[PDB]
Point group: D2
Chain length 386, copies 4
């Protein structure tokens, strides 16, 4: 019954199950978790792998020798379990030095430090086998309009990502970058606030082929946007390098609920899209077990993430396989949407009286779309009520 296996490619950040529960108005409720324990317990739950910020694995300010010992212990646990590390990222948001940003800090010396800290961890990520290096610019932005010249900040952002691309190209690394957009929190407004803005920015990088997006369910929903629609545009662009799964109740603080909570119908359509499109990347959960929970609740919440994905996968597959649903899709002309509008070309369209002078507007306007019957078939499938 909806048991995950490592072939499902479910992954978790060390900082997810390891979140000690410190929140905007509260102290930690759980003791710290050894990454070695997280690797072992996630393996037992059926996960494929784990991910990390540099500072999750190596305490900030560690000597080279302490750093080697921390990585060695972690690698031993990976070797013992067969767990993978498909993605890594840099923490450029917790330390006070990054209070005005890393790559777009107004202070130039901070921008240079942020790049050096990142480059060091790209090397570590490559040693551990990561295929994707995520950048979440949580401190890039402003609370007030005068504090940040956004055109200059975008220049600095581009410069930073261009330098990082030069680094991985010069080193011959087979790792690619994924930009994680977020609209706000912790800054009043964050730069590159949605999947759209990030995709647009990537097209102006010197080596755009090296960069994609890492969209997160909750982040897009914090702007009230349709997450499956945004994922569709990322897939259409060839840029869905990674994805972050969790739950969110619309427009409020970043909740990081387990996947399936929040907007359940959006989670269904998301899984339908990922599976139909053949997305082959990690299904990464960037969530936080609520601080009400003890460690039994931590592992229950992590298990729930994977369970809900697998239930939704089954229901979406049943929906698509149902001949009654296929009939409803045809009745609603979803198949016709895939036909080119004018493969006959511009001149033929202009010459086609059936497209204007002889187009029966009122007859076309009278055609029902049959979308409600289609959506109720989807609801029936989601709820197992067919």
């Amino acid at each position: 019954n909806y048991q995950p296996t490592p072939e499902d490619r479910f992954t978790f950040g060390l900082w997810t199950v390891g979140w000690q529960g410190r929140d905007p108005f509260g102290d930690a409720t759980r003791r710290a978790l050894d990454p070695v324990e997280s690797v072992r317990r996630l393996a037992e739950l059926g996960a494929h792998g784990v991910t990390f910020h540099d500072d999750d694995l190596i305490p900030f300010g560690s000597s080279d020798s302490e750093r080697e010992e921390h990585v060695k212990r972690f690698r031993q646990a990976l070797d013992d379990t067969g767990m993978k590390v498909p993605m890594a990222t840099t923490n450029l948001f917790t330390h006070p030095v990054f209070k005005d940003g890393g790559f777009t800090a107004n202070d130039r010396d901070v921008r240079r430090y942020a790049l050096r800290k990142t480059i060091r961890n790209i090397d570590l990520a490559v040693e551990l086998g990561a295929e994707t290096y995520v950048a979440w610019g949580g401190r890039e932005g402003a609370e007030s309009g005068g504090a940040k010249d956004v055109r200059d900040a975008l220049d600095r952002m581009k410069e930073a990502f261009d330098l990082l691309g030069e680094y991985v190209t010069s080193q011959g690394y087979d790792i690619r970058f994924a930009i994680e957009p977020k609209p706000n929190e912790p800054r009043g407004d964050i730069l590159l606030p949605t999947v759209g803005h990030a995709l647009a920015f990537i097209e102006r990088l010197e080596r755009p082929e090296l960069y994609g997006v890492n969209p997160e369910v909750g982040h897009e929903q914090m702007a009230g946007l349709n997450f499956p629609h945004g994922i569709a545009q990322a897939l259409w662009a060839g840029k869905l390098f990674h994805i972050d799964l969790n739950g969110q109740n619309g427009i409020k603080y970043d909740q990081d609920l387990r996947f399936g909570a929040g907007d359940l119908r959006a989670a269904f359509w998301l899984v339908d899209l990922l599976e139909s499109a053949g997305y082959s990347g990690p299904r990464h959960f960037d969530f936080k077990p609520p601080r009400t929970e003890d460690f039994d609740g931590v592992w229950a919440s992590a298990a729930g993430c994977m369970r809900n994905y697998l239930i939704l996968k089954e229901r979406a597959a049943a929906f698509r396989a149902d001949p009654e649903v296929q009939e409803a899709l045809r009745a609603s002309r979803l198949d016709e949407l895939a036909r080119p509008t004018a493969a006959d070309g511009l001149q033929a369209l202009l010459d086609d009286r059936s497209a204007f002078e002889e187009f029966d507007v009122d007859a076309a306007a009278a055609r029902g779309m049959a979308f409600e019957r289609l959506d109720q078939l989807a609801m029936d499938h989601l709820l197992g009520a067919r």
Copy 2:
């Protein structure tokens, strides 16, 4: 006393001051305006020009004699007043035939009709002098997840815009296209919901140089986004072809308040940005005088749009000219933000011990950013307490 004149390039849609007050819960409160009267009244208020949807000028279904008569009357008003027509657009949203979209309707015959209706109005727009042709895909989208395959819809949208670019290129027209993003309303979710999504889409068109964005204040605010930040990204990309100005109180239905209402501070930072950057396009008001108003109130509301822009322009200019503000900008290191992070190059950065091995993290972290003093100077200037 903040009197607008045609040099200010303020423009209005016929459908703005001409809105009869119908809403989904309410019947019209004002009689219809003759476009000729709107042109004359707007000219008397100091406007530079007007804009139109095809259906605002030419009643839908008009014979070619009626269409000719309507255009001649409108042209005569333009000739009498000296009013310009810098922009036009197609109504692909009011008539029931467009209830599932124009360019991305599931029905192919509707997609072709939408293109032919647009092409006809591009010709008229060019005749009347428009430099920009706006596309607002208000019916492109869905209420339910199964109703629209967004990857197929993006293919159809690209095909449509590619054909339009072929048309203008083949005719030798100088006009360019501006895509108007909106996140929702009237569809549950609209395709290309933000400036970012539209900018990203444009980069995948066959002739991207022919396309930019027409962002609207209220649209981006309906997603909770920072409108000046989005305009900055459009300017950074070279894609701010046109702009729609109005007011909105954050995340709720599309209010179309007069410019300056809604988020007043955001309006200040917007005007500062447009004026600083040297934006030279129309300052177009896409707003609706509330239906509480008679026609005296319609013209007061239109005059208020321009008045508020001019007051804000003065305050932003005073802010930037103030020596105390120039000092505060230096204190907050806005000058450092404009400097390249690493013009010495990647290898020099990697070899620079001051950027990592010898970087004093705690000394850097102790530096205040002085953003609050800067913002209070901005507040003082906005409110005329400076």
Copy 3:
């Protein structure tokens, strides 16, 4: 399979299935529906009854004779089907005379007219057997801060509802009032914007026992609030006289989706609460079949409303009946929440060292709440995956 029956007390407004599809940016897509047809078709679907605004049943401006004929036809259809009319309301929002409100219009003559129009329809509602008279003040409010003195408007609101209470008391009618709060749309902000504000206002009426609330799913979700939580406070207060069911995707324009769409998990917890608490009033659907639909889609959407309520009722009943769920509720101490905190009294609490001086804060802080396991049992039940 989830077939509704009239004993389920499902009701629909004439204006729901009869919505012709005119929306903020679009003309009607469907012809008008005869109320007699709506009564017959809703009866065939298993509905219990219908509801009406005065102007839905009797065209505004009808003579007494036309009014009698319209009501007679409608009553004949009710008599032929056994359908009931449990609720009625006044349209004080469509006609331009109400553009600044009915009961709180700034113009005093309009306020008096609004009351007379309402009183006439209370008489009709009583003739048709309505137990609840709903008041939705959709035009009560403002777009700008100077337009409406809210303290004076609340005085006028109270005066109006007090007069209506005097009327029903003097006539000896066994009908009660239900105030429908909404936060915005069509006004920029509406007076009494949530269930809370309406409950608070009712307590200051002269005859509070005559007044309750008619909360609507989407209305509370347009403020981002938790609809089941608000319903719980209404039930706690003894004030849930009626309820309006539909769907809404969080904070945007009022979508009026069919019940079950929008926030599906919130719909589950709502049905769980209504059924557990023993709510015995109508389950009224105030929804609009989307304008994409023909009349087959209208009736499908209406059927879907009832179907989704019944599926959710089954899943919530299964959840509560599951001994594993009951065990999880006890593990999370939901039963302990029902114990009085200090039925021993204030003095005993102050004297109880176990409540302060000997309270082991760290032992209590270490107790997990087990809420995630409980919520995953709820998810499993909702999706039929137990």
Copy 4:
């Protein structure tokens, strides 16, 4: 030059200027402030007084010697400066023991401990001169629908507040309670989420005269609500015991910006309302200097709160005094709104043919409301263009 003085009754929480900058994504950026220093600095800026949570003054877990020493130092600072303490509150949200609430924790022993912690601090508040005791139930609520039975929780909340009212009555204290509503954060949904819900709850307490509200600008705006409208309802009910002033950009995480930031127009209408109505309580700033700031920025931010209130007070006074505004208010019939609708009584209204049979609906509907001219006069005054 808008200098605050103690006559203005501006107050600040120790936790405001004392916020060290920790957020869920970030470590502290400022060292801890001695409350004695905060009292002295706030006095130098012109503040009237300070407020505190128990835990801000007395480190949690302090012995009675340490508690005594801390209170004496604080009192000495109050005596030295003349600063008052008009309000105090209990911290029932930071410590992990409160992770499921204080008064509505599922565990009864926690509910009793929360009450005892509150009662102890009521005694201290009264000793230091507080007239208002605030309760912000930041942990009362849930992330999931099964975790909290809201009807039982409201019973427990009423029981707690009833006991507190018995305590103050039994001791003969003059202090009154003010409930601070908030819709979410740190819980997914908080109980009593808005001013309306809190006002409604108070009416069901045993001694309702002892309880009012402490609304906070940002809290109501986090639900998209109109804060001046909510304050008007609290004033109408006689329940505005205290008020918390800050800034917020609509629906997103709790930003706690300085007052005047966020929604500037709403701040103008708020100050107009408080001053017009003769509100005589503290003007309390519950804000956080952003973590980008050093201590010079902390004091600049605090000074800016008061400066912005005073500028707005001047502009609102100028608006109301302007003869042109008095004319515009008459043109918009704000005077008619203050007149009773039907002081002649129900029977006279029913018998008045001018209110119905002879009411000229279309003549009434033709009247403009002149709200746009009125609002532009308000804008002109706010911006000092008048």
